[PDB]
DNA sequence: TGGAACCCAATGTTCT
DNA sequence: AAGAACATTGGGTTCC
């Protein structure tokens, strides 16, 4: 299960285990960006049906479980 | 002269209430189609121009409750 | 694993 | 006003 939005959980990118929608929606969120604003208390339900409602939420639970662009871990 | 939705300015008024255009699209849409959405928060969201994307549920509620109707027409 | 390339759902504007 | 057409966005899977 994805320690985000706990759909189908395929394998580590990006430092954890997560879906492939997440994966793709944690580089954009660095790389490219907008200000994302939660509209609840910071603290959206992320799952497969509604990852999409909060980009804030679940971009700040991408970085909370720890991911990061760099597998750099080589040194 | 603002959305009574979402506060983005008021293109008009729509289904018997005054509402920009995507608001006016959105509530078509919502009612004609399916409106099943579910809420991340707490069926509370702020629902502002840029907001208003995150959660139809809660912005198909805001339109509901502010009145807005299809029949407004014949309804006048 | 990472990412380019789709495809697609859902939204917002235009409609000399 | 109401709504069809179109344009775009942001997003999820598919392919290497
Ligand atoms: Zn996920
Ligand atoms: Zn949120
Ligand atoms: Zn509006
Ligand atoms: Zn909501």
Redesign the interface.
């Known amino acids: 299960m994805c320690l985000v939005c706990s759909d189908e959980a395929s394998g580590c990118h990006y430092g954890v285990l997560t879906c492939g929608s997440c994966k793709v929606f944690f580089k954009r969120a660095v790389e490219g960006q907008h200000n994302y604003?939660?509209?609840?208390?910071n603290?959206?339900?992320?799952?497969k049906?509604?990852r999409k409602?909060?980009?804030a939420?679940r971009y700040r639970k991408c970085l909370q479980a720890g991911m990061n662009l760099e597998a750099r871990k080589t040194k």
Do not use: F, Q, V, Y
Request: aromatic share 0%; glycine share 6%.
């Open positions: 604003l939660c509209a609840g208390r603290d959206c339900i992320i799952d049906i509604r409602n909060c980009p939420c």
